[PDB]
Amino acid sequence: RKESYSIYVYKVLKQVHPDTGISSKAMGIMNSFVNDIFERIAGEASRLAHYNKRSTITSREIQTAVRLLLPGELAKHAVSEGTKAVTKYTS
Amino acid sequence: KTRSSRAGLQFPVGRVHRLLRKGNYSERVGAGAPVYLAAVLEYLTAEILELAGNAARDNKKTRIIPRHLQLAIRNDEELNKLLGRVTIAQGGVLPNIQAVLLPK
Amino acid sequence: GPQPISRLEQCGINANDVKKLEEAGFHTVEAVAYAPKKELINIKGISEAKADKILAEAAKLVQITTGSKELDKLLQGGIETGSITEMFGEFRTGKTQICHTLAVTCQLPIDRGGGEGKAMYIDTEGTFRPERLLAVAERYGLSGSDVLDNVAYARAFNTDHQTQLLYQASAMMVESRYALLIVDSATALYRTDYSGRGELSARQMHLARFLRMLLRLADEFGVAVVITNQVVGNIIAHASTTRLYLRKGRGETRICKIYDSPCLPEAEAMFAINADGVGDAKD
Amino acid sequence: GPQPISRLEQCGINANDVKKLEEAGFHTVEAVAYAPKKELINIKGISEAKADKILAEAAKLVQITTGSKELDKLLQGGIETGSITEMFGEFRTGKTQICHTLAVTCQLPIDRGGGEGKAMYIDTEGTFRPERLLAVAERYGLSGSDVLDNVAYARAFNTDHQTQLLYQASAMMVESRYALLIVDSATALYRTDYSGRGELSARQMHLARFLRMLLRLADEFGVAVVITNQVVGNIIAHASTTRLYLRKGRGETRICKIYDSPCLPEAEAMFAINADGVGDAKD
Amino acid sequence: QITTGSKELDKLLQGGIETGSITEMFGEFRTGKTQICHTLAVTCQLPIDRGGGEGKAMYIDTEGTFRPERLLAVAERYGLSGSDVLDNVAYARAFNTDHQTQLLYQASAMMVESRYALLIVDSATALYRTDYSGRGELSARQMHLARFLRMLLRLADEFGVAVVITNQVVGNIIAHASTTRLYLRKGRGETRICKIYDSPCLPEAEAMFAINADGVGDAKD
Amino acid sequence: PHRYRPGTVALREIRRYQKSTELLIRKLPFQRLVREIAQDFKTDLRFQSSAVMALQEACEAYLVGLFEDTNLCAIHAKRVTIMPKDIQLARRIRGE
Amino acid sequence: NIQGITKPAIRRLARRGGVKRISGLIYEETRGVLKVFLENVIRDAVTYTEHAKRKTVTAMDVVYALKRQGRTLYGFG
């Protein structure tokens, strides 16, 4: 139908602030945010793969794209989480 | 069993994978790529919601509104940098008056 | 011994980076040395190249009586110097009282079961009482003033301050012979400071570094490492050599139990908390 | 002793904030002192800055016979002053009756197994009987009127009122020597007031503060802390030093059992509830 | 002590209900709670020397089971005027929990004008389940029952009357609160098994009794 | 009678409107403007409600930001009053 | 219709922008600026609308126009 990240945003919200809710407008802004960052990272990864004549986007392209797009500490922590998640997933 | 559960995530690995496959980004997508991406998106979401929740609590509100998101983002140097050319609807602006405009 | 971080400056690390390491809380070449690259990089104003230069040049440069006889027998004579001993028990079981007593008994002669060294009390819970130290000192016939003189005291306000005081303790413990390092409510600040749930890994990392520093100081100075834990942890088990379970007997007399020790049996010994002292049980 | 919150006002806390603390139920510098920041912040009209100023300036400023011989022997002579003793048992086992008796026996001479102190009965269940106190007093040859004069009485209507009376008890227990503090159906108000399920953590927090105040008063005044629990809790176990299980024997004679005590064996002793008294079993 | 008129129960109760206190009988359906209430509504009027309280009775019904003819039968059993029993029983049906509590105010003012010894509330807990049947409304029935019970105890202590409430076993505060607890289970026919599961005066003990046309009366196999 | 000095109420308004988030242009004239402008690009157009609201949020955010930069230009010239030349400098440097 | 964007409205916008004092000539200038902005965005929005073969401008049309003009808007997806 019409997809959004709302339920996942809400689960995360419940993780960081168990007794906090969120308005409809604010949720719309969070959805806009997730889609925006998705597009930025996926697009950069696409270009990375193209520049290097590769037909596959792998976690390495995602990671490099993250390093290009995110500033400083955000980049380091994001890289850490992605790596951790892939490691937990693989086994 | 879901992929998100195996990855320790809340964000949807399967959906992210499908969106990668169908977004005309590349002919192929590795198995780890949507896991990594979903993890990154979840991290950033968590950071923003953490700060916004704080702002909501200062305002003695139990619900996060766009204003709290704007306050959280603009008061954080790196988030503000990341979202430098982004407008948050109904976000307003940070309170800020140039010192020269003040009395005395 | 220590290798104050000043010597790292002659290797050609710039002085600003040494100031950044001290701001972070690293005050010795020992401190920079036994850490991976990422610790120095996370510090403001430090790149990966400076961290590699620091690690390379750093690699170039680099039984105490409890005073309760029953507890001494339970421990086979008292705490082994050079190792961490954890006593986990309910609140008011006497962890703080035992710490205050040990802060003086450590200063006792070795022939009396002491270590003939000064004590260090790092408080996180406000329960530091110089008068309790004076009472224990006069009990065992030690100078109460010298106990406070053999106790350098600072209250750790947070986990970072709790770990940072060990760096000051590490540099300070070199100038005087110590036998005891006290961290009271050692786990309380990791719950009060890191109160969120996403920050649990952060408190675990900070606690891990704190524990490594405690073990390091124990092996360096031959001092006893005493930490008190409120149970409203199994991580300490591998780090702690002897786990003692403490529970209250009514009045001022406390029951001690061993609930894990790879060397000591699970067993119990009875002791009391007396105005002067932590002292044998007198039913 | 106590440090009435009035002295906090000279440190430069504004008087309105002290009134807000008293409205919250904090009446001593002791009360503000042993609490974290969040307790004062949750109070209406108190910011985090005022709470930090309060805590900082506060840190600158800051065997009783049961009259049943068999029970005394079970307890090794009677309740230890300075500690909380919990008796959990079915309803009508005599918890309230034992409380009424102790409210007088506490006033007995120490040579008779008393504490030579006044009693405090905080009732939550309506079972307070001045006539029972008069009967126990005449039984042991104590002035029944003085027992009521050595019992300051107020019925706690809720958990907040139950805890608030301890603050009044704490200030009042300073003016007269007490030996016994009675909280009857202590857990009943936490079930009747906090009857929802999402509010369980709230009753646990309020009960925790109440128990800490009870232990504080016991250590401060050397009084016995007696609470009665209806079992239609294990949290009290770490707080309570001696757990006594009470069950009824037919007529007015009650069976007492020890079901946990770190010091006393699990064992039983027989006693009775007599018009005059809680008194030895006479089969 | 108000005599039940069953010797086995009287011995079980050591002579009968204490006036001035609340007595709860929780038991299965058809165990005889209502029958015991009807009997007591008359025995209360018996002389104290006969085990009565020498007072009039109050029957507050919540379940429709009020039978003036049962009062007449109990009265003729014990040799009391059945008509005067109905004349010494002021009767009102509590229509809801609020009306059940509201009847106590009229009962409180009325109990001053005449000497009573017994107050009967039949299916006292039934209206808190039938009226408050939802789950979010549980606190409402518990808080209304709590106020109702405090009024009952006050009236019992004020008039020295017996307070009888009936509980169906298909609040936990009442166990310690009820002064005499009889556990009722059916023996087949009209003969009932009684057990004491709580009592402040009485032992935990059991006694066998029957429900007879005349009376609530001892089991006679 | 009381009168605030020039500037006091202005500052009060700054604090007031920087504190809040409500749209500052009236709905109906903005909508009218949007439809007028749209007509010179394509005939027969309709608008989703949220489309007009989107345009207004964007426009007001743009103007507020531009006024921030304009203010910086005025202050740069040791003034406290914004003038058209301030706006024009801001827009030139923005690349507009 | 541009005159419908009144002086007090422009003043409120300037206040949120931190402006304390305002020249009389600002208002007309602001209007011109606003018009240009609107025109550009709307021109793109309608283009999207026309590509989709619709007669109704959607919120998404506007969002895409804004995005492609480097003025990303959150909240209307």
Q: How do the domains of chain B map onto residue ranges?
A: 2-104
Phi and psi based region of residue D217 (left: phi greater than 0; alpha: psi -120 to 50; beta: remaining): alpha
Residue F81's identity, in one-letter code, is: T
Q: Kindly give the interhelix angle for G7-16 and F8-19, rounded to the nearest 10 degrees.
A: 70
- A15 and C196 within 8 Å at the Cβ level: the answer is no
Report d(CA D15, CA E30) in Å as an integer: 66
- C248 and D242 within 8 Å at the Cβ level: the answer is no
In the block, tokens 């203010």 appear at F71
What value, to the nearest 5°, has the Cα angle with vertex C96 and ends C90 and C101?
130
- Segments forming the whole domain that contains residue G43: 1-77
Please tell me which of the candidates B26, B53, B86 has its beta carbon nearest to residue A20. B53
DSSP 8-state code for residue C79: B
DSSP 8-state code for residue E92: E
What's the burial of E146, exposed, middle or buried (CB within 10 Å: 0-12/13-18/19+)?
Answer: middle
The yes/no answer on whether domain F1-96 falls in CATH 1.10.20.10 is: yes
What's the burial of B22, exposed, middle or buried (CB within 10 Å: 0-12/13-18/19+)?
Answer: exposed
D84: helix, strand or coil? strand
Residue D246's identity, in one-letter code, is: L
- B36 and A36 within 8 Å at the Cβ level: the answer is no
Residues 245-264 of C with CB under 8 A from D: 247-253, 255
- Chain C residue numbers with beta carbons less than 8 Å from the beta carbon of D263 are 249-250, 253, 255
Report d(CA D230, CA D183) in Å as an integer: 12
A7 Cβ neighbours under 8 A, 6+ residues apart = none
Structure tokens at E153: 């105890």
Question: Is residue D258 a contact partner of residue D265, using CB atoms and an 8 Å limit?
Answer: yes
In the block, tokens 């039913």 appear at C283
Interface check for G68 against chain A (CB to CB < 8 A): the answer is: no
- C255 and D262 within 8 Å at the Cβ level: the answer is yes
Residue C50's identity, in one-letter code, is: K
Please tell me which of the candidates G20, G66, G74 has its beta carbon nearest to residue B88. G74
- B86 and G72 within 8 Å at the Cβ level: the answer is yes
Question: Is residue C278 a contact partner of residue C66, using CB atoms and an 8 Å limit?
Answer: yes
Interface check for B87 against chain F (CB to CB < 8 A): the answer is: yes
Question: Is residue C223 a contact partner of residue C196, using CB atoms and an 8 Å limit?
Answer: no
Question: Is residue D13 a contact partner of residue D57, using CB atoms and an 8 Å limit?
Answer: yes
Structure tokens at B37: 């991406």
- D248 and E139 within 8 Å at the Cβ level: the answer is no
What residues of D form the annotated binding site?
89-96
Residues 3-62 of G with CB under 8 A from F: 4-6, 9-23, 25-26, 29-30, 33-35, 37-39, 41-43, 45-46, 49-50, 55-59, 61-62
Q: How many domains is chain G built from?
A: 1
Structure tokens at C141: 């016939």
Contacts 24+ apart (CB under 8 A), A46-50: A46/B25, A46/B26, A49/B25, A49/B26, A50/B26
R_g (Cα) of chain A, nearest Å: 15
CA atoms in the 13 A half-sphere facing the CB of E220: 8
Laid out side by side, the sheet with D242-248 consists of D151-155, D118-123, D178-184, D224-229, D84-89, D242-248, D253-260, D268-273, D278-280
Q: Kindly give the interhelix angle for C95-105 and C130-139, rounded to the nearest 10 degrees.
A: 50
- What is the number of other CB atoms lying within 10 angstroms of the CB of residue E106? 12
Report d(CA E52, CA E41) in Å as an integer: 10
Question: Is residue D161 a contact partner of residue D185, using CB atoms and an 8 Å limit?
Answer: no
- Contacting chains of B (3 CB pairs or more, <8 Å) are A, F, G
Interface check for A48 against chain B (CB to CB < 8 A): the answer is: no
Annotated ligand binding at C175? The verdict is: no
Report d(CA E153, CA E161) in Å as an integer: 10
What is the number of helices (H) and of strands (E) in chain B? 5, 3
Interface check for B75 against chain F (CB to CB < 8 A): the answer is: no
Q: Tell me the C-alpha to C-alpha distance, in Å, between residue G27 and each of F72, F73, G9.
A: 18, 17, 10
D134 Cβ neighbours under 8 A, 6+ residues apart = D144, D145, D147, D148
Closest CA to E52 of E167, E171, E162, E189: E162
Question: Is residue C186 a contact partner of residue C77, using CB atoms and an 8 Å limit?
Answer: no
Strand locations in chain C (E):
84-89, 118-123, 151-155, 178-184, 224-229, 242-248, 253-260, 268-273, 278-280
Structure tokens at F3: 């009168």
Q: How many residues would you count in chain F?
A: 96
Q: Tell me the C-alpha to C-alpha distance, in Å, between residue E66 and each of B60, E34, E85, E103, E211.
A: 57, 8, 13, 16, 16
Structure tokens at A13: 């919200």
Q: Number of A:C CB contacts under 8 A?
A: 6
- F87 and G39 within 8 Å at the Cβ level: the answer is no
Backbone angles phi, psi at B28, to 5 degrees: -130, 155
Question: What's the CA dihedral at D167, D168, D169, D171 to 10 degrees?
Answer: 90
Report d(CA E217, CA D121) in Å as an integer: 44
- What is the number of other CB atoms lying within 10 angstroms of the CB of residue F27? 11
Where does A1-91 sit in CATH, by number?
Answer: 1.10.20.10
Q: Which of B79, B85, B94, B102 should we substitute to test contact with G (largest number of G Cβ atoms within 10 Å)?
A: B85
- A15 and C197 within 8 Å at the Cβ level: the answer is yes
Interface check for G77 against chain B (CB to CB < 8 A): the answer is: no
Residue D258 β-bridge partners: D244
Report d(CA C217, CA E199) in Å as an integer: 66
Residue E114's identity, in one-letter code, is: S
Q: Tell me the C-alpha to C-alpha distance, in Å, between residue C181 and each of C31, C79, C102, C135, E173.
A: 18, 12, 9, 19, 53
Q: Which of F22, F42, F60, F94 should we substitute to test contact with G (largest number of G Cβ atoms within 10 Å)?
A: F42
Rounded to the nearest 5 percent, the helix, strand and coil shares of chain G are: 65, 10, 25
CA atoms in the 13 A half-sphere facing the CB of E79: 2
Backbone angles phi, psi at D13, to 5 degrees: -55, 130
- D82 and C192 within 8 Å at the Cβ level: the answer is no
Q: How do the domains of chain F map onto residue ranges?
A: 1-96
- Chain G residue numbers with beta carbons less than 8 Å from the beta carbon of F37 are 35, 38-39, 42
Structure tokens at D278: 């809680």
- Chain C residue numbers with beta carbons less than 8 Å from the beta carbon of D224 are none
R_g (Cα) of chain E, nearest Å: 16
E65 Cβ neighbours under 8 A, 6+ residues apart = E34, E122, E123
What resolution (Å)?
4.7
Annotated ligand binding at C96? The verdict is: yes
From B84's Cα to the closest Cα of chain G, the distance in A is 10
DSSP sequence for B2-42: -HHHHHT-SS-HHHHHHHHHHTTS-SEE-SSHHHHHHHHHH
Residues 152-191 of E with CB under 8 A from D: 153, 172-173, 175-176
CATH number for the domain harbouring residue G16 = 1.10.20.10
Distance, first Cα to last Cα, chain A: 33
DSSP 8-state code for residue E131: T
| Closest chain C CA to residue D36 | C192
Report d(CA G5, CA G20) in Å as an integer: 20
A10-21 in b/e form (b: 16+ CB < 10 A) is bebbebbbeebb
R_g (Cα) of chain G, nearest Å: 15
Architecture of domain B2-104: Orthogonal Bundle (1.10)
Residue E104's identity, in one-letter code, is: L
Residue C180 β-bridge partners: C119, C224
Residue D176 β-bridge partners: none
- Look at strands D84-89 and D151-155 and give their pairing: unpaired
Annotated ligand binding at C94? The verdict is: yes
